[PDB]
Amino acid sequence: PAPHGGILQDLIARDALKKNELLSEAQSSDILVWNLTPRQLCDIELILNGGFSPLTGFLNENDYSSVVTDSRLADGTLWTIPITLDVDEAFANQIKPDTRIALFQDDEIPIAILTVQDVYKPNKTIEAEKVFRGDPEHPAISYLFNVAGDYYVGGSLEAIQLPQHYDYPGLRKTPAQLRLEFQSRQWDRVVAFQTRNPMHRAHRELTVRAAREANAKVLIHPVVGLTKPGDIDHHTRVRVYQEIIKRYPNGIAFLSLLPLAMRMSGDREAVWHAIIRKNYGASHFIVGRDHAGPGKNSKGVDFYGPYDAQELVESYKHELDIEVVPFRMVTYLPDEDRYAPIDQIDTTKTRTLNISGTELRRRLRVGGEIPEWFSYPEVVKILRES
Ligand SMILES: [Co+2]
């Protein structure tokens, strides 16, 4: 399908012919330099590779304000999560419109040149309330107030190179690369699966079922960048994904890593995910229960309703030109030796076998056996005493 906004803003491709010139400038002694923070590095990779199309830079206050209150850029284009370059007060004081800033990675690798449009002090309370629902315990709000700089710098970017990664080379396909991969296989219908956790037999079954019902193929698109605090190590997860994809039906699935910095912003994040996956070439997107949700706060109160994400994305589906596929968990039916959607099993006389996240975690820590009906032996081994 077409990128969000119609154009894949692959700035690496756009500025390829001026890389030497931009690199030279970024290394000059007179240019202002900003060392990107971990979250900014994830965000900038997705802006530069077109993952955040139509974005071509960090949001100026005009667009930021519209995103915060109306979930749209100033021109009306759907966009739910503000992507801004947050800096400290002193740095903001040295900036003025038209100032060109060299953005670096690890204070040594030139990533891009930002042409400043504005520098402003956002009202973070409004951002926390409108974008993240206001609970002080929400991961995005804690980040917003404690870690994020208090000043935002809006501006357009010119690309030099994508952030450098030293893990799993070639596994982070860009939107252009994935789109070509799909086209090369004549995959016009692709259902994307978001995850920041390991995958078991049930996930293999639900994604395969989703693909078959939609007459499409499967894109396992796990996040490897910034996920939820306490998640399984990224190396363990990647090994799990590489192994489990081998268990999929002949030529129905493809695996690629997404270097996204999740905000754990529930429904708004689910819409953002749909946009991102559309930019990466997907036609369908699975939306889970409490999709991208932080769970419950200290008082046992859910940050988001379980179906808020599904409902919000469904409401924007026509505008996004993407199809929403509700996450349909499957379970194992021993009396029929088959897998079926938990929904399919009405409150009647039907037995099922399951292993809770709690039981799984505890068995893995004591070397307890895990049944094959729950997960493939090769996958379990990877999670074993990890
Ligand atoms: Co690593």
Curated annotation (Swiss-Prot):
Enzyme class: transferase
BP-aspect Gene Ontology terms: hydrogen sulfide biosynthetic process; sulfate assimilation, phosphoadenylyl sulfate reduction by phosphoadenylyl-sulfate reductase (thioredoxin); sulfur amino acid metabolic process
Binding site for ATP: Q194, T195, R196, N197, G288, R289, D290, H291, V330
Induction: Expression depends on the formation of the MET4-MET28-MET31 and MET4-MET28-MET32 complexes on its 5' upstream region.
Residues under site feature: Induces change in substrate recognition on ATP binding: F327
Keyword Nucleotidyltransferase among UniProt keywords: yes
Sequence segments annotated as region (Catalytic): 167-386
UniProt region (N-terminal), positions on chain: 1-166
Active site: T195, R196, N197
Keywords assigned: ATP-binding, Cytoplasm, Nucleotide-binding, Nucleotidyltransferase, Transferase
Cellular component GO terms, alphabetical: cytoplasm; mitochondrion
Keyword Iron: no
Catalytically driven reaction(s): sulfate + ATP + H(+) = adenosine 5'-phosphosulfate + diphosphate
Chain sites annotated for binding sulfate: Q194, R196, A292
Positions bearing the site annotation: Transition state stabilizer: H200, H203
Subcellular localization, as worded in the UniProt entry: Cytoplasm
Gene Ontology MF annotations: ATP binding; sulfate adenylyltransferase (ATP) activity
Pathways per UniProt: Sulfur metabolism; hydrogen sulfide biosynthesis; sulfite from sulfate: step 1/3
Principal subcellular localization: cytoplasm
EC number annotated for this UniProt entry: 2.7.7.4
Similarity comment text for this entry: Belongs to the sulfate adenylyltransferase family.
Subunit and interaction comment: Homohexamer. Dimer of trimers.
Leftover remarks: Present with 1510 molecules/cell in log phase SD medium.
This protein's domain notes: The oligomerization domain is distantly related to APS kinases, but it is not functional and does not bind APS. It is required for oligomerization of the enzyme, although the oligomerization state has no effect on the catalytic activity of the enzyme.
Purpose: Catalyzes the first intracellular reaction of sulfate assimilation, forming adenosine-5'-phosphosulfate (APS) from inorganic sulfate and ATP. Plays an important role in sulfate activation as a component of the biosynthesis pathway of sulfur-containing amino acids.
Protein name in the entry: Sulfate adenylyltransferase
Part of the whole protein covered: 2 to 387 of 511
